Amino acid sequence: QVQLQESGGGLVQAGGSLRLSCAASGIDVRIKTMAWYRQAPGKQRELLASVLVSGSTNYADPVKGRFTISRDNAKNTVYLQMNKLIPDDTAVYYCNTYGRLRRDVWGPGTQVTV
Amino acid sequence: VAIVKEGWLHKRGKYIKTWRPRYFLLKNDGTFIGYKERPQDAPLNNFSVAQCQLMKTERPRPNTFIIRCLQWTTVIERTFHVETPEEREEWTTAIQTVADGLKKQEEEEMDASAEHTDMEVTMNEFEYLKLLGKGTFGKVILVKEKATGRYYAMKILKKEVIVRVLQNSRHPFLTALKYSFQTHDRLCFVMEYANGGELFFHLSRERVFSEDRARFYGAEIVSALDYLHSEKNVVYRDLKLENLMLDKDGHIKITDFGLCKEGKTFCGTPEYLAPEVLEDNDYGRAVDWWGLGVVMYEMMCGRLPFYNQDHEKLFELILMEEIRFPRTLGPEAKSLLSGLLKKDPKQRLGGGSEDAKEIMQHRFFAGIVWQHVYEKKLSPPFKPQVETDTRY
Ligand SMILES: *Cc1ccc(CCNCc2ccc(-n3c(-c4cccnc4N)nc4ccc(-c5ccccc5)nc43)cc2)cc1O
């Protein structure tokens, strides 16, 4: 079974931190751009961070400086370090590749609440 | 590119014979191409099986299979028939495999080359105004965008037969895709609609265009086709006077309103069919230069080069009868038309490796600055009587 599985959500006291991990089993995170997204109840799913195959990172304004995206090639997993969190960060968090993104395929996501 | 499977198949025909034995190549680049006999040693996307959907059937003939593809905004179907059900299996299988192979390599490639393109309109936005066409898999209607008052053509296809504006063709004289959206059961393509009127009407009212007027429209057609042929690797195969309109300023628009497919009577307009298309021979870029020849003959003579109300006799004329010209046509125009209407595509103007360049170098177009044609820097010989003016 080919898929992405997010883990590491939960409740945390605002201004805390959290590491989310996206375990690709059946996919090679090394050959793909990977991004992190989030979606909250009334809102549209929000692109958060990307890491190209070179390793080049990039982040959307609401999270610049607070979150870091990293790729563990050896562990076929992407990670999102969440620092100095805020209620406005509360959401379900998803990771994904380009192809799955355009086909609207998503793993289970992990829920985070501040 | 290597051959992946090859052999004989009966190819369904739409014009003359119905079923014709053809020798087909399936190549790892997706091209699935039929030939009158085993061919003895640029590829057109028209013949690609990529993103095809395959279906098996038993009518009319047993052991038939259908390839169905969305080509830009058009659903096209290629129908085939073999002798045994096992034979079919090997073919549909060979085709799926090449096709999956292409999807696979491609997805892998864009997954690896995506560059923060990892980002994440409906029926009610529009006023129906007039059916433009109807067909197997959908319809084309004239609509008014409610928010803006602007007029568009909306192609509405049935989503089941199948299952993008950033991938437009940047040529001024082709129909541009404005929006593309899907409903619960439909796939919708909103495309520009010229409001300079139908060139078929303008030609009718005027009886004939002068050689200089035809020269202007031809240059613009030649430029749009050079672009399709060389930038996109596609043949239009649909050139006819009724698929030419004018924009507000008088420049050509080639329409993209076709659905299903053409062809006792024929379901469309057969007077523009090239010989090799009628014979279901293999065809390439040169079919569009034949259509160019028929269109410009009609413009400069005020009548078709071959007509009969019986399509059978018409077909005979197209394949067999030599072109005749009105007395008032000059030799440069006669030279271009007779070279575009060569029945053998290999000896047609434009049918060599140079393609459009041969036509732009013909003496009929001497003095045309093709860079200015492309940039709409040429001055239209006729400005239609009109932006959102429903004049036509
Ligand atoms: C009997 C019968 C009838 C008709 C056909 C197929 C006819 N299709 C007509 C066609 C072909 C190409 C395009 N096209 C355009 C285009 C052309 C003219 C005006 N505006 C525009 N936009 N632009 C593109 C881009 C890509 C492709 C494409 C083609 C093949 C495969 C993949 C992509 N096509 C166009 C429009 C209309 C067959 C038949 O048997």
XYZ file of C-alpha atoms and ligand atoms in Angstrom:
546
model
C 0.000 0.000 0.000
C 1.383 3.355 -1.188
C 0.542 6.293 1.061
C 1.505 9.165 3.355
C 0.716 9.111 7.069
C 0.898 12.140 9.306
C 1.454 11.765 13.031
C 2.321 13.830 16.069
C -0.711 16.024 16.667
C -2.359 16.920 19.932
C -3.034 19.772 22.315
C -0.230 22.140 23.296
C -0.077 25.330 25.346
C 0.230 28.331 23.014
C 3.836 29.377 22.600
C 4.768 25.712 22.796
C 6.301 23.612 20.056
C 5.493 20.420 18.132
C 7.172 18.152 15.555
C 4.865 16.632 12.940
C 6.181 13.706 10.899
C 4.982 12.446 7.502
C 5.911 8.795 6.899
C 5.940 7.908 3.197
C 5.548 4.165 2.678
C 5.450 3.261 -1.002
C 6.807 6.644 -2.103
C 10.316 8.092 -2.314
C 10.381 11.429 -0.503
C 13.838 11.981 -2.038
C 12.502 12.176 -5.624
C 9.610 14.562 -4.791
C 8.928 18.076 -3.654
C 7.143 17.736 -0.322
C 4.888 20.306 1.311
C 2.905 20.718 4.507
C -0.649 22.063 4.506
C -3.341 22.737 7.076
C -7.107 23.140 7.113
C -9.380 24.518 9.826
C -13.178 24.109 10.162
C -14.528 26.933 8.126
C -11.483 27.551 5.987
C -9.785 26.448 2.802
C -6.740 24.179 2.958
C -3.616 26.310 3.338
C -0.184 25.612 1.871
C 2.452 26.005 4.597
C 5.956 24.883 3.591
C 7.864 23.081 0.836
C 11.285 21.419 0.509
C 12.563 20.781 -3.028
C 14.714 17.772 -3.884
C 17.825 19.948 -3.650
C 16.723 20.768 -0.092
C 15.607 24.328 -0.840
C 12.965 25.305 1.714
C 10.256 27.904 1.492
C 7.441 29.080 3.744
C 4.251 31.113 3.536
C 4.098 34.378 5.457
C 1.868 33.288 8.417
C 4.558 30.838 9.496
C 7.847 32.286 8.238
C 10.382 31.820 11.029
C 8.191 29.807 13.400
C 8.035 26.470 11.517
C 10.810 24.529 9.784
C 10.359 21.848 7.110
C 13.033 19.166 6.871
C 13.394 15.903 4.937
C 15.053 12.776 6.353
C 16.049 10.929 3.171
C 17.300 7.967 5.193
C 14.009 7.695 7.105
C 11.694 8.346 4.102
C 9.864 10.975 6.106
C 9.278 14.684 6.126
C 9.060 16.717 9.313
C 7.519 20.054 10.269
C 8.914 21.716 13.386
C 6.247 23.982 14.932
C 7.641 26.625 17.313
C 5.925 29.480 19.188
C 2.442 28.322 18.324
C -0.843 30.225 18.332
C -4.542 29.452 18.483
C -4.711 30.661 14.874
C -2.544 27.615 14.131
C -5.257 25.160 15.260
C -6.107 22.901 12.334
C -5.625 19.487 10.768
C -2.169 19.169 9.185
C -1.434 17.238 5.958
C 1.725 16.487 3.984
C 1.826 15.719 0.303
C 3.580 15.400 -3.048
C 2.823 17.332 -6.210
C 1.082 14.449 -7.996
C -1.125 13.522 -5.058
C -1.889 17.204 -4.590
C -3.286 17.638 -8.096
C -5.336 14.417 -7.838
C -6.741 15.523 -4.447
C -5.301 12.459 -2.673
C -4.583 13.014 1.027
C -3.363 10.987 3.958
C -5.237 10.940 7.244
C -3.723 14.219 8.537
C -2.950 14.940 12.219
C -4.981 17.393 14.281
C -3.253 20.198 16.189
C -4.965 22.577 18.651
C -3.449 25.481 20.635
C 11.651 5.584 -29.533
C 11.077 1.866 -30.034
C 8.217 -0.203 -31.417
C 6.320 -1.938 -28.622
C 3.780 -3.906 -30.709
C 2.928 -3.926 -34.387
C 0.614 -5.796 -36.714
C -2.610 -5.659 -38.653
C -5.971 -4.324 -37.500
C -9.123 -3.341 -39.292
C -9.532 0.413 -38.762
C -13.062 1.759 -38.834
C -13.472 4.485 -41.449
C -15.872 7.405 -41.434
C -15.860 8.319 -45.094
C -15.750 5.585 -47.713
C -15.201 1.925 -46.812
C -16.188 1.510 -43.121
C -13.535 -1.170 -42.401
C -10.045 -1.009 -43.859
C -7.045 -3.248 -43.097
C -4.149 -1.176 -41.789
C -0.742 -2.018 -40.344
C -0.305 -0.296 -36.992
C 2.715 0.613 -34.873
C 2.503 1.121 -31.120
C 5.564 2.987 -29.890
C 6.928 3.595 -26.421
C 6.413 7.342 -26.955
C 2.659 6.796 -27.131
C 2.160 7.108 -30.873
C -0.295 4.539 -32.288
C -0.170 5.010 -36.065
C -1.718 3.041 -38.946
C -0.305 2.604 -42.453
C -1.641 1.185 -45.711
C 1.177 -1.401 -45.594
C 4.169 -2.333 -43.418
C 6.061 0.963 -43.617
C 9.725 0.682 -44.573
C 11.577 2.861 -42.052
C 8.009 14.800 -36.296
C 5.447 12.810 -34.276
C 1.923 14.203 -33.975
C 0.107 14.172 -30.632
C -3.129 13.484 -32.516
C -1.989 9.830 -32.640
C -0.935 9.510 -28.987
C -2.537 6.964 -26.672
C -1.376 8.847 -23.574
C -4.193 9.388 -21.071
C -6.414 7.271 -23.298
C -9.349 5.290 -21.971
C -9.889 1.848 -23.510
C -13.237 0.128 -23.989
C -14.205 -3.290 -25.382
C -17.359 -3.881 -27.378
C -18.959 -6.379 -29.733
C -21.093 -4.114 -31.965
C -21.121 -3.544 -34.811
C -18.399 -6.272 -35.227
C -17.121 -8.642 -32.547
C -13.676 -8.208 -31.061
C -13.752 -4.413 -31.435
C -12.062 -1.966 -29.082
C -12.235 1.828 -28.798
C -9.538 4.272 -27.729
C -11.024 7.474 -26.312
C -8.920 10.579 -25.609
C -9.514 14.189 -24.629
C -7.387 16.206 -27.031
C -7.338 19.775 -25.683
C -11.073 20.387 -25.523
C -12.278 17.636 -27.874
C -13.245 14.024 -27.196
C -11.998 11.848 -30.042
C -12.548 8.090 -30.442
C -10.503 5.634 -32.537
C -12.332 2.356 -33.239
C -10.651 -0.974 -34.130
C -11.544 -4.620 -34.806
C -9.456 -7.826 -34.748
C -10.184 -11.456 -35.582
C -9.879 -13.134 -32.178
C -10.757 -11.996 -28.651
C -7.252 -12.987 -27.609
C -5.858 -10.666 -30.268
C -7.816 -7.791 -28.776
C -6.468 -8.581 -25.316
C -2.877 -8.357 -26.461
C -3.542 -4.971 -28.076
C -5.556 -3.268 -25.326
C -2.928 -4.619 -22.967
C 0.024 -3.378 -24.994
C -1.703 0.012 -25.182
C -2.505 0.290 -21.478
C 1.074 -0.596 -20.640
C 2.647 2.041 -22.883
C 0.111 4.519 -21.523
C 0.664 3.701 -17.852
C 4.391 3.841 -18.575
C 3.975 7.393 -19.851
C 1.810 8.546 -16.944
C 4.341 6.993 -14.561
C 7.478 8.606 -15.997
C 5.656 11.927 -16.283
C 4.278 12.065 -12.763
C 7.702 11.061 -11.408
C 9.255 13.907 -13.389
C 6.933 16.684 -12.188
C 6.955 15.359 -8.626
C 10.745 15.838 -8.805
C 10.680 19.218 -10.565
C 7.851 20.985 -8.698
C 9.018 24.392 -7.410
C 6.557 25.781 -4.847
C 3.882 25.129 -7.430
C 2.752 22.959 -4.486
C -0.130 25.414 -3.916
C -3.794 24.477 -3.497
C -16.406 29.686 -11.519
C -19.567 27.537 -11.958
C -22.617 27.065 -14.176
C -24.596 29.776 -12.399
C -21.975 32.402 -13.330
C -23.259 32.207 -16.918
C -26.263 33.072 -19.064
C -27.143 30.568 -21.777
C -27.909 32.318 -25.071
C -27.779 29.861 -28.014
C -26.774 26.299 -28.908
C -23.647 26.476 -31.060
C -23.393 22.731 -31.616
C -24.400 19.353 -30.276
C -22.659 16.035 -30.311
C -22.103 12.645 -28.801
C -20.354 13.709 -25.613
C -21.586 17.243 -24.981
C -22.695 20.554 -26.396
C -21.267 23.972 -27.217
C -23.423 26.995 -26.378
C -23.056 30.746 -26.540
C -23.060 32.194 -23.023
C -22.842 35.594 -21.356
C -20.623 35.773 -18.282
C -23.028 37.392 -15.813
C -20.468 39.315 -13.726
C -18.889 41.004 -16.798
C -21.308 40.991 -19.751
C -18.597 39.385 -21.913
C -19.531 36.655 -24.407
C -17.921 33.202 -24.473
C -18.338 29.763 -25.987
C -18.817 27.086 -23.350
C -18.065 23.482 -24.358
C -19.978 21.187 -21.978
C -18.811 17.556 -22.055
C -20.122 14.524 -20.192
C -17.574 13.846 -17.463
C -17.997 10.064 -17.631
C -16.638 9.703 -21.179
C -13.393 11.378 -20.054
C -12.705 10.276 -16.468
C -5.762 23.916 -17.822
C -5.729 27.568 -18.849
C -2.126 27.740 -17.598
C -1.383 25.415 -20.562
C -2.863 27.738 -23.203
C -1.505 28.190 -26.721
C -0.054 31.721 -26.897
C -1.067 32.371 -30.456
C -3.360 35.321 -31.215
C -5.378 33.646 -33.978
C -6.350 30.436 -32.096
C -9.266 30.164 -29.660
C -7.985 30.728 -26.121
C -9.273 28.842 -23.111
C -10.593 31.376 -20.601
C -11.864 29.083 -17.808
C -12.101 25.343 -17.304
C -14.229 23.851 -14.503
C -16.125 20.649 -13.714
C -19.535 20.089 -12.136
C -20.825 16.921 -10.499
C -21.325 15.324 -13.921
C -19.894 17.784 -16.479
C -16.584 19.178 -17.667
C -16.810 22.756 -18.928
C -14.449 24.744 -21.149
C -15.094 28.472 -21.465
C -13.293 29.800 -24.527
C -13.133 33.122 -26.274
C -15.823 33.988 -28.802
C -14.935 36.515 -31.512
C -17.582 39.177 -32.133
C -16.382 40.334 -35.574
C -18.807 37.950 -37.262
C -18.470 34.662 -39.139
C -16.106 34.846 -42.097
C -18.449 32.458 -43.911
C -21.154 35.154 -43.762
C -18.753 37.959 -44.691
C -17.530 36.000 -47.681
C -21.099 35.193 -48.680
C -22.250 38.810 -48.588
C -19.199 40.011 -50.527
C -19.278 37.147 -53.092
C -15.462 37.056 -53.238
C -12.409 38.474 -51.501
C -9.730 40.140 -53.594
C -6.334 38.453 -53.773
C -4.931 40.957 -51.283
C -7.733 40.359 -48.786
C -7.362 36.573 -49.024
C -3.608 37.030 -48.691
C -4.127 38.722 -45.329
C -6.416 36.040 -43.898
C -4.218 33.262 -45.318
C -1.100 34.701 -43.752
C -2.898 34.744 -40.415
C -4.106 31.153 -40.874
C -0.653 30.040 -42.039
C 0.796 31.604 -38.903
C -1.651 29.901 -36.539
C -0.943 26.519 -38.216
C 2.815 26.819 -38.250
C 2.394 27.360 -34.508
C 0.127 24.328 -33.998
C 2.430 22.164 -36.136
C 5.795 23.205 -34.705
C 5.096 24.425 -31.163
C 2.417 21.882 -30.215
C 3.011 19.038 -32.719
C -0.699 18.843 -33.523
C -2.569 18.951 -36.793
C -5.809 20.869 -36.768
C -7.441 18.723 -39.456
C -10.571 20.883 -39.083
C -9.930 23.869 -41.335
C -13.052 25.134 -43.079
C -14.548 28.548 -43.840
C -17.216 28.056 -41.199
C -14.539 27.586 -38.513
C -13.095 31.051 -39.273
C -14.464 34.142 -37.532
C -13.290 37.754 -37.177
C -12.508 39.632 -33.996
C -13.592 43.233 -33.337
C -10.531 44.585 -35.184
C -10.831 42.301 -38.199
C -8.176 39.686 -37.370
C -8.791 35.978 -37.880
C -9.973 33.673 -35.103
C -9.846 29.911 -35.778
C -12.601 28.366 -33.704
C -12.375 25.449 -31.296
C -16.042 24.479 -31.243
C -15.831 20.952 -32.656
C -17.311 17.957 -30.837
C -17.512 14.179 -31.416
C -16.373 13.646 -35.027
C -17.660 13.852 -38.601
C -18.788 11.163 -41.060
C -26.559 7.995 -46.933
C -25.348 11.368 -45.600
C -22.388 12.708 -43.606
C -22.844 14.259 -40.161
C -20.789 17.378 -41.037
C -19.145 19.321 -43.884
C -17.148 17.024 -46.211
C -16.221 19.477 -48.935
C -12.923 20.301 -47.145
C -11.633 16.739 -46.665
C -8.137 16.020 -47.972
C -7.673 12.948 -50.226
C -5.527 11.034 -47.730
C -8.171 11.582 -45.076
C -10.875 10.249 -47.397
C -8.788 7.132 -48.187
C -8.006 6.669 -44.451
C -4.375 6.714 -45.459
C -1.853 7.945 -42.951
C -1.918 11.713 -42.682
C 0.171 14.446 -41.106
C 0.802 18.175 -41.138
C -0.079 18.312 -44.833
C -3.831 17.846 -44.317
C -4.016 21.365 -42.870
C -2.316 22.795 -45.979
C -4.978 21.117 -48.104
C -7.674 22.762 -45.999
C -5.821 26.060 -46.388
C -5.950 25.517 -50.159
C -9.699 24.852 -50.114
C -10.354 27.867 -47.874
C -8.330 30.269 -50.026
C -9.805 28.881 -53.225
C -13.246 29.628 -51.802
C -12.193 33.132 -50.715
C -10.724 34.123 -54.103
C -13.199 32.351 -56.398
C -16.437 32.616 -54.414
C -17.105 28.867 -54.675
C -15.625 25.551 -53.600
C -13.007 23.847 -55.773
C -15.021 20.581 -55.592
C -18.736 20.371 -54.916
C -21.628 18.045 -55.564
C -24.711 17.559 -53.436
C -23.959 13.806 -53.492
C -21.069 13.259 -51.102
C -20.133 10.109 -53.046
C -19.587 12.079 -56.235
C -17.929 14.848 -54.209
C -15.496 12.275 -52.823
C -14.713 11.180 -56.375
C -14.057 14.777 -57.409
C -11.723 15.329 -54.455
C -9.718 12.190 -55.121
C -9.732 12.282 -58.927
C -10.618 15.561 -60.631
C -8.015 18.156 -61.468
C -8.490 21.639 -60.103
C -10.094 24.211 -62.448
C -9.791 27.978 -61.872
C -11.944 30.967 -62.823
C -10.520 33.051 -65.651
C -9.945 36.099 -63.431
C -7.386 34.466 -61.120
C -3.715 35.450 -61.490
C -0.774 33.060 -61.770
C 0.710 33.599 -58.301
C -2.651 32.670 -56.746
C -3.080 29.775 -59.205
C 0.386 28.548 -58.257
C -0.348 28.586 -54.523
C -3.760 26.933 -54.806
C -2.566 24.216 -57.177
C 0.370 23.458 -54.874
C -1.836 23.297 -51.763
C -4.394 21.072 -53.521
C -1.898 18.512 -54.790
C -3.695 15.240 -54.142
C -0.507 13.458 -53.110
C 0.371 14.861 -49.653
C 4.057 14.172 -50.270
C 4.041 16.549 -53.257
C 1.811 19.222 -51.674
C 3.028 22.710 -50.863
C 3.888 22.499 -47.182
C 4.179 18.704 -47.167
C 7.954 18.611 -47.002
C 10.062 18.741 -43.865
C 9.956 22.553 -43.922
C 6.131 22.559 -43.456
C 4.816 26.130 -43.043
C 8.113 27.641 -44.250
C 7.437 26.390 -47.796
C 4.120 28.241 -47.817
C 5.492 31.449 -46.314
C 8.228 31.409 -49.011
C 5.723 31.014 -51.859
C 5.636 34.002 -54.176
C 1.971 34.615 -53.355
C 3.048 35.755 -49.879
C 6.072 37.789 -50.986
C 6.501 40.872 -48.859
C 4.555 39.474 -45.882
C 6.589 40.076 -42.707
C 5.650 36.963 -40.750
C 6.854 38.515 -37.504
C 4.325 41.303 -38.042
C 1.618 38.802 -38.921
C 2.223 37.114 -35.583
C 2.074 40.434 -33.740
C -1.160 41.625 -35.349
C 0.939 44.447 -36.850
C -0.669 43.841 -40.243
C -3.590 46.120 -40.994
C -6.926 44.345 -41.484
C -8.492 45.046 -44.895
C -11.920 44.996 -43.277
C -13.029 46.141 -39.840
C -16.281 44.496 -38.728
C -19.080 46.889 -37.810
C -18.658 46.960 -34.004
C -16.439 44.924 -28.014
C -19.513 43.437 -26.296
C -21.578 44.571 -29.309
C -23.833 41.685 -30.400
C -23.747 43.104 -33.940
C -23.370 39.622 -35.471
C -13.802 13.169 -38.283
C -12.947 13.911 -37.368
C -13.220 15.254 -37.067
C -12.403 15.939 -36.199
C -11.296 15.341 -35.616
C -10.422 16.113 -34.658
C -10.590 17.614 -34.853
N -9.957 18.393 -33.778
C -9.817 19.787 -34.148
C -8.821 20.512 -33.285
C -7.490 20.125 -33.250
C -6.578 20.810 -32.467
C -7.012 21.878 -31.709
N -6.102 22.579 -30.866
C -5.955 23.933 -30.611
C -6.720 24.974 -31.329
C -6.941 24.836 -32.696
C -7.654 25.799 -33.379
C -8.111 26.898 -32.692
N -7.920 27.087 -31.378
C -7.215 26.157 -30.689
N -7.058 26.376 -29.384
N -5.038 24.159 -29.683
C -4.586 22.898 -29.296
C -3.630 22.475 -28.377
C -3.422 21.119 -28.240
C -4.157 20.190 -29.020
C -3.998 18.714 -28.933
C -4.263 17.914 -30.044
C -4.101 16.537 -29.994
C -3.651 15.938 -28.835
C -3.378 16.716 -27.727
C -3.542 18.091 -27.774
N -5.077 20.610 -29.909
C -5.250 21.932 -30.014
C -8.335 22.257 -31.711
C -9.227 21.592 -32.527
C -11.021 14.010 -35.895
C -11.837 13.301 -36.768
O -11.533 11.999 -37.026
